[PDB]
């Protein structure tokens, strides 16, 4: 699609066999998620954002669906005010910022 | 142009007769640049994100140029650790996201 941004850019995700809403975030370096159940083993990261940072568990190779386009790569959980397809994913489904 | 995701979507702003560096944020409600003086009266504003929220200094009917593209709105203020271009400013250069 061409999105505009007179609303917030939130599409549909599926993880995990759920669908959810998400972010369409080209200021997020990578995805962050809300708590949720994922497979396998997670590794520590911390992300920094506008009030400071946080501690998240990344998730690598993760299938998700995003605006039904599918991407497979790291994912990030943790609390995440609201959930965000970061620029990891962004390019995975092809997204360019264009004006 | 046609800005790729690979990296981040920073661009040259000029704010306040200031060249600075911002992020293009798609994720972002709001336009906020590290503390500066500009013109007019301001009130307070809480904005939120990762790691929680910071207090900032509300401007409106700022103009900023972005990557060439003039575009006036409100111009928030404040110790944010990267100077951000949101969505109300996004959209009056005509952004888009695309895939
Ligand atoms: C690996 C890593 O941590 N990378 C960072 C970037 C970075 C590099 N070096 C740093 C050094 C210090 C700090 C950060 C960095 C990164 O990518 N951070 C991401 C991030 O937070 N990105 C921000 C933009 C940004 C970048 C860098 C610094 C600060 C901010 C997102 O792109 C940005 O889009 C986020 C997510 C959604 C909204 N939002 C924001 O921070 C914005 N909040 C908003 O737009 C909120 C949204 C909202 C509505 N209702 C709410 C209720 C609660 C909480 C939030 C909201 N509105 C308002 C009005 O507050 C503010 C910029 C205004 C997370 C999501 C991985
Ligand atoms: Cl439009
Ligand atoms: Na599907």
Redesign the interface.
């Known amino acids: 699609?061409?999105?505009?941004?007179?609303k917030?850019?939130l599409v549909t995700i599926k993880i995990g066999g759920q669908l959810k809403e998400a972010?369409?975030?080209?200021?997020?370096?990578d995805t962050?998620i809300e708590e949720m159940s994922l497979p396998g083993r997670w590794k520590p990261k911390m992300?920094?954002?506008?009030?400071?940072?946080?501690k998240v568990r990344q998730y690598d190779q993760i299938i998700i669906e995003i605006?039904g386009?599918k991407a497979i790569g790291t994912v990030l959980v943790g609390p995440?005010?609201?959930n965000?397809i970061g620029?990891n994913l962004?390019?995975q489904?092809?997204?360019?910022?264009?004006?």
Chains 1, 2 share one sequence.
Do not use: C, E, K, Y
């Not at 972010?23 to 370096?29: N, S």
């Not at 489904?93 to 004006?99: C, D, S």
């Open positions: 699609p061409q999105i505009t941004l007179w917030r850019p972010l369409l975030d080209t200021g997020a370096d962050v992300i920094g954002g506008i009030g400071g940072f946080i605006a386009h995440t005010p609201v965000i620029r962004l390019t489904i092809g997204a360019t910022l264009n004006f």
